[PDB]
Design a protein around this ligand. Sequence first.
Ligand code: BCL
Ligand code: BCL
Ligand SMILES: CC[C@H]1c2cc3[nH]c4c(c3C)C(=O)[C@H](C(=O)OC)c4c3nc(cc4[nH]c(cc(n2)[C@@H]1C)c(C(C)=O)c4C)[C@@H](C)[C@@H]3CCC(=O)OC/C=C(\C)CCC[C@H](C)CCC[C@H](C)CCCC(C)C
Ligand SMILES: CC[C@H]1c2cc3[nH]c4c(c3C)C(=O)[C@H](C(=O)OC)c4c3nc(cc4[nH]c(cc(n2)[C@@H]1C)c(C(C)=O)c4C)[C@@H](C)[C@@H]3CCC(=O)OC/C=C(\C)CCC[C@H](C)CCC[C@H](C)CCCC(C)C
Ligand SMILES: COC(C)(C)C/C=C/C(C)=C/C=C/C(C)=C/C=C/C(C)=C/C=C\C=C(C)\C=C\C=C(C)\C=C\C=C(C)\C=C\CC(C)(C)OC
Ligand code: HEC
Ligand SMILES: [Ca+2]
Ligand SMILES: [Ca+2]
Ligand SMILES: [Ca+2]
Ligand SMILES: [Fe+3]
Ligand SMILES: [Mg+2]
Lengths: 259, 318, 277, 51, 56, 63, 313, 65
Amino acid sequence: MSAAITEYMDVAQLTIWAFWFFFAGLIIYLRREDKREGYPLDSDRTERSGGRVKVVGFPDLADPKTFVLPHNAGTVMAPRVEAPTSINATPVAPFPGAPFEPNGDPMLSGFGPAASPDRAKHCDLTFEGLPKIVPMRVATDFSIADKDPDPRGMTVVGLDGEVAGTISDIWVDRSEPQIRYLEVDVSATKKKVLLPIGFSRFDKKAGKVKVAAIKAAHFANVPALSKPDQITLYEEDKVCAYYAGGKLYATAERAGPLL
Amino acid sequence: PEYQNIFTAVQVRAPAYPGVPLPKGHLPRIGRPIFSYWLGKIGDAQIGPIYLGFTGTLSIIFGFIAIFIIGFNMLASVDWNIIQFVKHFFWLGLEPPAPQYGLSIPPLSEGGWWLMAGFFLTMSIILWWVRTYKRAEALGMSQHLSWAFAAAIFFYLSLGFIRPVMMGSWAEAVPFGIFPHLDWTAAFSIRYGNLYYNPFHMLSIAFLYGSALLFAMHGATILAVSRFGGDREIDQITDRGTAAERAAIFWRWTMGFNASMESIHRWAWWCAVLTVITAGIGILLTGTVVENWYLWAIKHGVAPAYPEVVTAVDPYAT
Amino acid sequence: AMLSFERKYRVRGGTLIGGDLFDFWVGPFYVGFFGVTGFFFALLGVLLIVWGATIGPNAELQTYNIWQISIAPPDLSYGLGMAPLTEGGLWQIITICAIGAFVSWALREVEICRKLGIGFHIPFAFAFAIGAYLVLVVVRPILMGAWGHGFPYGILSHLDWVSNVGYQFLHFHYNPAHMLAITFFFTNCLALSMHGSLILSVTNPQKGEEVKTSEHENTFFRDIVGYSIGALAIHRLGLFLALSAVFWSAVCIVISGPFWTRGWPEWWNWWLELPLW
Amino acid sequence: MSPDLWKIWLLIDPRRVLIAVFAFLTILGLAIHMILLSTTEFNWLEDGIPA
Amino acid sequence: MSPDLWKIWLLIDPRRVLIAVFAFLTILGLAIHMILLSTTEFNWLEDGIPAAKVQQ
Amino acid sequence: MSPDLWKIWLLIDPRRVLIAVFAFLTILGLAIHMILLSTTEFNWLEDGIPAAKVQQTPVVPQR
Amino acid sequence: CERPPPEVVQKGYRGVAMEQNYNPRLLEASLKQNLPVESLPAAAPGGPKVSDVYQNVQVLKDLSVAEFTRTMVAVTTWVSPKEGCNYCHVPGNWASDDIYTKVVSRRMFEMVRAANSDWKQHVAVNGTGVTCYTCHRGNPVPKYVWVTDPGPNQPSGVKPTGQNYASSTVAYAALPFDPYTPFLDQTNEIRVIGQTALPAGNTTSLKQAEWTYGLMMQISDSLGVNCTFCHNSRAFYDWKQSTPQRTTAWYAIRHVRDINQNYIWPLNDVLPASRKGPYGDPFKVGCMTCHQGAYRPLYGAQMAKDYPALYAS
Amino acid sequence: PQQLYKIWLAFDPRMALIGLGAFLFALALFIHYMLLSSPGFDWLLGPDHAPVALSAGMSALPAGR
Ligand code: BCL
Ligand code: BCL
Ligand SMILES: CC[C@H]1c2cc3[nH]c4c(c3C)C(=O)[C@H](C(=O)OC)c4c3nc(cc4[nH]c(cc(n2)[C@@H]1C)c(C(C)=O)c4C)[C@@H](C)[C@@H]3CCC(=O)OC/C=C(\C)CCC[C@H](C)CCC[C@H](C)CCCC(C)C
Ligand SMILES: CC[C@H]1c2cc3[nH]c4c(c3C)C(=O)[C@H](C(=O)OC)c4c3nc(cc4[nH]c(cc(n2)[C@@H]1C)c(C(C)=O)c4C)[C@@H](C)[C@@H]3CCC(=O)OC/C=C(\C)CCC[C@H](C)CCC[C@H](C)CCCC(C)C
Ligand SMILES: COC(C)(C)C/C=C/C(C)=C/C=C/C(C)=C/C=C/C(C)=C/C=C\C=C(C)\C=C\C=C(C)\C=C\C=C(C)\C=C\CC(C)(C)OC
Ligand code: HEC
Ligand SMILES: [Ca+2]
Ligand SMILES: [Ca+2]
Ligand SMILES: [Ca+2]
Ligand SMILES: [Fe+3]
Ligand SMILES: [Mg+2]
């Protein structure tokens, strides 16, 4: 029982080698956990082989893991199969790794920055089973903090500083009190559209809302809700993606380059 | 320019939330919650309530006794002069017994108070660990947090208790002070030959830098996709939306591989824990199986060599 | 190659420089113009590091051991001028190549996030680490007066540089900005451990139980410490701590030598010489 | 001093004033006793009197 | 100096100024006493006057 | 200065300038008094004037 | 706070970062405090001898009268210029020894002549030399002496630790603040680091490394340098990687121990009580007594070579 | 240049004045600091700057390789 195993080896060397073995095992485990979403990959190697060679890399995938959702919403497998889709674009060039062109009208195309998957068509729920994101017209116990603007009646201006409507209601979150959406009453179609907070800037001096994503004339194509009191995971994603597409498709100068 | 979601522009007030009901046989939560406006610009503007059981009361008592002993000895070291106590506060400390006692109990002024303070502080830390385990299990959750706290406690006990017992003396332990314990940290490296050459020290530093890198990347990633609802990570884990897809695709295009919304939080968990695990080993090997880390590195061909441009004559080798 | 849900996002445009000239993907990577520039800067830097290892400090101390390979900066007698290739100019060329590669990487990230339609938090955060490196090898050598104040490029030799620079001030723990940076680093590690633990605990409950909701996350930390910060605020705080650590470390290293040339404990004398005591 | 000083108590909360003055007086007494203990002339325990 | 200075209480809240004055005066008294005790000339306890019954 | 200077208060309110000035002059006076106390030429307490009448034992000449 | 740039002296291999940094303004101010004194003109060589005109000459027995009086005139300037010659000599004559100052100075002469002949591996590398002015600088009592420090007052039943207290003797660190007694007066081991990769019977505690650290802080404060002036910090124990000044420091420690044990302590009987510490020991010599913040006394000004009465032969 | 007034048709003057003032102030600070560092143009040393002369074989800085 000493510190020298041989003429060259000692304890502090064996300990570091044992750590390296454990670290290799841990890295394999973490990389296997990383591969529960989006694998097996979609490449030319699979389709040339007639759907025979599946590209997963190393290490391969794990056995499916089960999540059970509350209030009897169902069960979801962490590694699952999903239906291959047909995109709304067309390749710019036939060589591999080439970009695609957003066929049609880019805002109303569902491709690029204006793209989204199809989530479940049910509202997110609280711990008691109520809808989670609701307007303040039904969450009456809520209130605006003191010494704060209360953005009701504020005019919303578009990308070019042209007014596109006014705020009508505020959609809040019952579980965590914060604002998730603004409701804009568009004065071009007599309709009401939702606007995420992440795409709006509060000019509290002059009482304005700035939307730098889309222009004033684009507020007429925002996807609408099914019922005026609640929203689903599908519609929220669609609404956010429509505004996100304007970060590239709004004007002719936003595609680049600088030089 | 564009809203970066760093501060909350407009706040909304709802009534206080007592919390998820606890099962039978639990005490009620104490305190009435209140709201802070300035605290609500960066996070949640609600403070309280708190749960205090029996383990939580015992932890408080033990810890306050330990801290009172430490403070009383710091005050006694300046002969009861409170002004001089304020002047020298960062330099004062309570320090371990002398090396001529081994693992015995010295008088109070010569290291008994240090032993009592260490025992009581260790008891409070253990009781707080039990409290965290019990609160995790009361709500039906798992026990990851208690495992991470157990790793931290393992490093703490290696630093203060296990290594001195292995070396056979209490003088190897760290003092209770601000500048005193930094002095201990410097002297430990000097005595055992340049701790930079300890390979577990190298691994621990790598994991600390990695924790900082991982938290910066994850925070920036979640803040960048929060316009799509990305901050609600549980929903994205159980139902993948555009936030998770864009976050994965960004990193896949940047560095060739990516993680998942669920999987990244594992990379976060293991990176931090391995910071302290490799730390606790690194000092248990020091002084027990390795005497000089620089000479150990030279023996294993790790230390670099430089041209001889300055040198000294050895007066012990004449 | 492509994830099973990635083909919807490979759109044309959003480039900063180049347009359609370099707008393509190479395997999983997106390259662009800055991809080309950064890749070839990195390639030349690697090849020059390998050649510097091949030459070695001498013909006798040259070795291919990875722990012992070191490329060193010039002497302090050259000032801010350009040194001969064998006497420290290779270090300067490699430093230029490294700076070019880092800036190219950041600009490629900017292009990628313009393409995906997301915010610019990630390149902004990377710029802090780039700035810390630039303070290490550019700002401090110019303020001091010579390129020889930079650190050598080697796995074990730059540790020797850190140790000797630290002992030039006799006790580096008493540097105040150093204390602030260390506090931020430790706090960041603690916060990361807690965030990971809570998310995993909620997502992986006890056996025969359903996935926990958002209320449980807040209740847990209100019952442990009496306060909960929220889902978005924990990421805010993590980014803030991780960037503050680096900012204060850069401050701590740029004041050692240029703005203070004595021992670091002595700096505290202003507190000990107050007339109150 | 004018007799109408009793109007102070409708300007500041009596409970907070009571607790603040109690805490301040206790802290002041402790501080003065310790400062006296730190000296050589006024340390009644180590003065050696009576021997 | 001015027969109209009593308007000052129409601007600054008296309840705040009372607290900000009492606290400031207490802190100032403590600081001045500490400054005096930090000198060898005005330290009334360790000056050796009158006499010294204890040995040091 | 100009007779029409009194218009300055149409831009700055009395409360936020009165508080600032009153919280500023006190700090300036404290800082100046401390600076003078720090020097050996303008320290009125330890200047030795007038006389000492305080006796000032072996000493430690390292400090 | 200071403003750049500093003056830098490189000591090691490039990239190893063994350098000295000086603030030019601080350097000029420090230089203003260490100027030398212009020497007296040389004496006429020849004439009457010392051993034939003086009675109680014991140390300077082998000089000439002109050189003897020149040496007396110079040491009047070096030590006691204000009081003159009555400081050492009783008024009325010169052969009497009824005053302690003359005896102390007679011992000091032997100390200086021993320093200039027996310790040339310390004080004669560049021929700087040691004179009475090196320590006194015109003052009867040197400005940088030390005694055994008792530390801050403690309660009657509390055992002192000797540390955890801000002190300028260790450059304002929380290290043991009295490194003089165990090292510069007594003879304790300074080495704490082992010289094998694996344990073999080296039971030095961790608390002794702090005492060594305190002594090194005092040494570097006395010389106005940093650690890398003598060391390479990756191996403090390694003499092969150190600088030539480390050997000089090694000899200087022994020189100071010799001075304290053999020249200062035996004088403790005849010195007045105003020259002693609270423990009853006299004022003693350290690294600060001669260097006074410079890497050489007076930055290496050479004034000892002009006076041949300060050499043993 | 003849028709330079068209340069204000592309750049907003309100931002241009802010940028110009900030840049000019930064340039002035940098140049003053550079002069303060230089050993020839340092007016803080005083008009009567007389560095200490070395009477004997003394050197302010230690020798280095
Ligand atoms: C005796 C020595 C002194 C000491 C002397 C010094 C000196 C000297 C320095 C520090 C610095 C640090 N010290 Mg210290 N320090 C000491 C003791 C400590 C202790 C301790 C427990 O005692 C701790 C925790 C620390 C901690 C710290 C940190 C605050 C800081 C290092 C982090 C940093 O700068 O990030 C900065 C991060 C970077 C620079 C990363 C840059 C990476 C970029 C992005 C480039 C890309 C990398 C790569 C090329 C990518 C490709 C790689 C692969 C191919 C994929 N020190 C002792 C007392 N310390 C350093 C500092 O503050 O620097 C600013 C510093 O210079
Ligand atoms: C040279 C050093 C001298 C010395 C010279 C002086 C001089 C000169 C002065 C003091 C003053 C004070 N000294 Mg002294 N002082 C010495 C030694 C001491 C010792 C001691 C342990 O030996 C103590 C405990 C004190 C304590 C005190 C306080 C009583 C007082 C400062 C009070 C304060 O902080 O107001 C801050 C708090 C407030 C102002 C709150 C406001 C009070 C209210 C609103 C107004 C008064 C109402 C009152 C509370 C109740 C009714 C009182 C009526 C007016 C009768 N001195 C030594 C001997 N001392 C000052 C004094 O006399 O104050 C009265 C003063 O001018
Ligand atoms: C993964 C490794 C990292 C880590 C992890 C970690 N730390 C943890 C945990 C985990 C997983 C916990 O679960 C636990 C916790 O509770 O977190 C919220 C904790 C914790 N880490 C802590 C500290 C901590 N962690 C550190 C580091 C790290 N922790 C690592 C970097 C450090 C450093 C770097 O030094 C510190 C200081 C605690 C805040 C907490 C555990 C607290 C605990 O156990 O306390 C027990 C004792 C008491 C409560 C005594 C109290 C007695 C009286 C109340 C005193 C009265 C006087 C009072 C102090 C006066 C002042 C006024 C007061 C009102 C403040
Ligand atoms: C500022 C907060 C923290 C942070 C953040 C951060 N780092 C980042 C990012 C962010 C946000 C990225 O987006 C970016 C990334 O892509 O991450 C995956 C990155 C990154 N941070 C990295 C590393 C890294 N970060 C570190 C630190 C930190 N990064 C901070 C703690 C460290 C430390 C502490 O040492 C390292 C090593 C990379 C993995 C990656 C950037 C990759 C990159 O720039 O690639 C381009 C360059 C090359 C591929 C080759 C360069 C060619 C050179 C010739 C190499 C040698 C240069 C060197 C000067 C010589 C050798 C040095 C010796 C010491 C060996
Ligand atoms: C108003 O406030 C009052 C006056 C009441 C109290 C104030 C107190 C103050 C101001 C306290 C300040 C405290 C400070 C600054 C503390 C600093 C502490 C630090 C930095 C500590 C850092 C490290 C210390 C460590 C790691 C010590 C670890 C020791 C351990 C683990 C020892 C365990 C020992 C055991 C279990 C011994 C058992 C032996 C037996 C049981 C026999 O002992 C009795
Ligand atoms: C050059 C040859 C001389 C002469 C003529 C003297 N000294 Fe020194 N000296 C030194 C120390 C530490 C002391 C003790 C402190 C003290 O007593 O003041 C002395 C003391 C003296 C005295 C006695 C003065 C007195 O207090 O009455 C005298 C007369 C005296 N010295 C003369 C230190 C040193 C040195 C440092 C190593 C050197 C060199 C000298 N002295 C040289 C001389
Ligand atoms: Ca008594
Ligand atoms: Ca008195
Ligand atoms: Ca006076
Ligand atoms: Fe997260
Ligand atoms: Mg200590």
